[PDB]
C-alpha cells in the first residue's frame, strides 16, 4: 500500500525514457530488493501448512488412544459420590504425563509411546484415590487392553465365561499355557481360569498401583485444595489424621464440627490458624449444615489466608455412611477415602 502511495505523483513528469526511470527508482531500486524478497517469504510459506497437519497426525497414536480413555473415565459417574472428576483433572494428570514429572517429559515420537504407558499409569492413579478397590479393579480389569495395548481384546476363560455360561472354562491352575487365541487374545484365557480364586484380578498384577498414592505425598499440593477424608460408618477417618499428623511433626489442631460452639470455633480457629499457618483437622462438617452454608465461602477465605501466611493446611473428615457431601466443595477439595 505504501507503493501505492510512493508510486504516484510523478507520472506527472516521465515518459517511460530510462534517464527519465532513474528519478523514479530511487523508489522502485528499494523495492526490486523487498518487493522481491516478499516473493522469496511467500514461497515459504506453503511449506508449514502440510507439516503443520503431518505434525497433528503424529500426535494422533495417543489422541484417539486417549481420547478413547476419557470417555471411558466419564463412565465412572456411575460412582455416587467421590468420583466428581472434572476434566480439567484429567488435564492435570497429562500436565503431569506430559511434563510435570520431569525434564524428560516433553513430547517425542518415540515418546508418544510412552506416554501412552504414562496415560495408562497416571490416569488410574488419580482415580483411584476417590473411587474405591471394586472399581480400581474392574478398571484394570477391561481397560488395560487399551492404556497399555491399544485395544488388544483378550479372551475370557472360566470365571467371565462362567457367569455367562460360555464354552472355554479352565480352574485354578491355568497359567499361560494354551492362551494362543484370535483376536480376542491370550493371557485372561490365563487369568480367568486362575480365577476360581478371585484374588486373580489382583494376579493380574498389570503395574495396577497408585505410583503417587501416598497421601503424604499429596499434602503437598495447592492448598485450595483441601483435604476431604471419606469414611464410613464406625469407620474412624480423623484417626488415620492424627496418624498424619503424627508423622507431620506440625502444630495441630482438630476441630469436630457440629454444635454451635464448634462453629464459634471454626470462624475464631479458622481466622486464627489461616494467619499462623497450622494444620487442623476437621470432623463431620455434614453435622453443621448451616455451617456449611457459611463456610463455604469461609473457604474461599481461608483459602486466599492459606495463600498468604502459606501453611494453612485443612483435614476435613468423616464422610460417613450417606451424609452426601455437597459438589461444589468436593470440587474445592481432595476426597480420598479409606477402609477399616
Known sequence: KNLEKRLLEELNNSQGNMLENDELMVTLNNLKKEAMNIEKK??????????????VEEYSIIGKHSVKIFSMLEKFGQFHWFYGISIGQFLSCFKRVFIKKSRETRAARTRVDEILWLLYQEVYCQFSTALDKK???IMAMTMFCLYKFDIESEQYKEAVLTMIGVLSESSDGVPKLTV??????????????????????????????????????????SENNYFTMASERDVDG???????????????KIIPLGS????????????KSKIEGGWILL???????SWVKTYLHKHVEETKAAE?????????????????????????????????
Open 135 to 137: 472399581f480400581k479393579m
Open 180 to 221: 494362543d487365541t484370535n483376536d480376542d487374545l491370550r493371557y485372561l484365557w490365563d487369568y480367568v481360569t486362575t480365577k476360581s480364586y478371585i484374588s486373580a484380578l489382583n494376579w493380574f498384577k498389570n503395574e495396577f498401583f497408585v505410583d503417587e498414592w501416598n497421601i503424604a505425598d499429596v499434602v503437598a499440593n
Open 308 to 340: 498468604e501466611h502459606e501453611k494453612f493446611k485443612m483435614f476435613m473428615t468423616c464422610h460417613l455412611t450417606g451424609d452426601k457431601l455437597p459438589a461444589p466443595l468436593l470440587q474445592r477439595t481432595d476426597r480420598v477415602v479409606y477402609e477399616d
Open 260 to 271: 454451635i460452639e464448634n462453629l464459634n470455633y471454626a470462624q475464631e480457629e479458622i481466622s
Open 283 to 289: 470432623q463431620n462438617i455434614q453435622m453443621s449444615l
Open 42 to 55: 511467500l514461497s515459504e510459506s506453503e511449506e508449514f501448512f502440510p507439516q503443520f497437519d503431518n505434525l
Open 238 to 252: 480423623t484417626f488415620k489424621l492424627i496418624e498424619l499428623a503424627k508423622a507431620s511433626k506440625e502444630s495441630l
